[PDB]
Ligand binder design. Structure first.
Ligand SMILES: Nc1ncc2cc3cnccc3c(N)c2n1
Length: 338
């Protein structure tokens, strides 16, 4: 039914002409449109599947963006601006400023290669500033991932970089914004037991110990390592394998978190019940590595990045670095006068 109303040429709300699809999910899709009542300006419209789960998420997102766009009308803190919302043939549609590619599509279309370190630095700072602003307003985003970070403009120059032997796309401007506030939760709201997309899920979430702001910090840690590597660090759908991956990369989970989890399935007597010599086990041993072994250079800037990531990927949420502390980290010094 959604395909009936989201095609090129369609006009929504007697105003917005659909050009093309920007992205799709189980929530619905986002299409680029020409706004004929605003001079031809292109915008992005999110058309939400007509399903209670996703409908409530959209009403929720509207609430949250009205708050944030009011607090921060100039978008100093880099949340996407919502321009309008409306109903179209029973579907909630939310209009946003049009942005560039997500950091995920860019990596994908560039052959799954990493970003340059100086871009990672600017991007990381903006992500941390943005989400920290959410945290100031008693909000957790809960679904941070590279699909939900978008370049403001994804214009690029090309050069034959013979370090790979292939034409290369290089970002002109690495500014980003954060999108997708339909899972965002206030400190006082009910916290659902399963949040975040699998690969960016914090261990307190997987183990169902409760969560709040710190789980975003774990997500940002994952995002940063993917920017550095150009691939997903926890490419698994299974929770136990995910936990095994964490151990191979970050070492054993804290005894005290294991004792507390309602998810007894995953464990035996204080250790993860994981057979290293199994098929999946041997894959994890050879693929996954201790964090620091992923570094591509001993150069101090690389070390600095990896120190920050390590602190974002602290298992115990109570000990995990906060974004307020993260913004003062030495990795970011190169962005400041002195
Ligand atoms: N290019 C572009 N521009 C704005 C967007 C807003 C969005 C707002 N919420 C979710 C997804 C969204 C997108 N994929 C967007 N894509």
């Amino acid at each position: 039914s959604m395909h009936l109303i989201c095609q090129s040429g369609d006009v929504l709300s007697a105003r917005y002409e659909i050009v093309d699809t920007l992205g799709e999910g189980a929530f619905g899709k986002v299409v680029e449109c020409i706004d004929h009542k605003a001079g031809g300006r292109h915008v992005a419209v999110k058309i939400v599947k007509n399903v209670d789960r996703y409908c409530e998420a959209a009403r929720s997102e509207i609430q949250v963006l009205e708050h944030l766009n009011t607090t921060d009308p100039n978008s100093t803190f880099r949340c996407v601006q919502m321009l309008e919302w409306f109903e179209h043939h029973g579907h909630i549609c939310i209009v946003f400023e049009l942005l560039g590619l997500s950091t995920y599509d860019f990596i994908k279309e560039n052959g799954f290669l990493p970003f340059r370190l100086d871009h990672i630095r600017k991007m990381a700072y903006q992500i941390c500033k943005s989400v920290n602003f959410l945290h100031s307003n008693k909000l957790t985003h809960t679904d941070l991932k590279p699909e939900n970070i978008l370049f403001v403009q994804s214009d690029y120059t090309e050069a034959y970089n013979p370090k790979i032997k292939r034409d290369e796309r290089t970002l002109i401007n690495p500014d980003i914004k954060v999108v997708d506030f339909g899972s965002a939760t206030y400190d006082d709201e009910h916290h659902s037991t399963l949040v975040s997309t699998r690969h960016y899920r914090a261990p307190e979430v997987i183990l169902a110990l409760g969560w709040s702001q710190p789980c975003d910090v774990w997500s940002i840690g994952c995002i940063l390592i993917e920017y550095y590597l150009g691939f997903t660090v926890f490419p698994t759908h299974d929770s136990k394998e995910h936990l095994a991956m964490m151990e191979r990369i970050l070492g054993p989970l804290p005894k005290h978190m294991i004792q507390k989890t309602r998810k007894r399935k995953y464990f035996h007597h204080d250790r993860l019940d994981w057979d290293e010599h199994s098929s999946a086990g041997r894959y994890v041993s050879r693929a996954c590595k201790p964090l620091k072994e992923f570094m591509l250079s001993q150069d101090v800037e690389h070390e600095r990045l990896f120190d920050l990531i390590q602190k974002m990927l602290e298992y115990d949420p109570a000990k995990r670095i906060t974004l307020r502390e993260a913004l003062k980290h030495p990795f970011f010094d190169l962005l400041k006068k002195s």
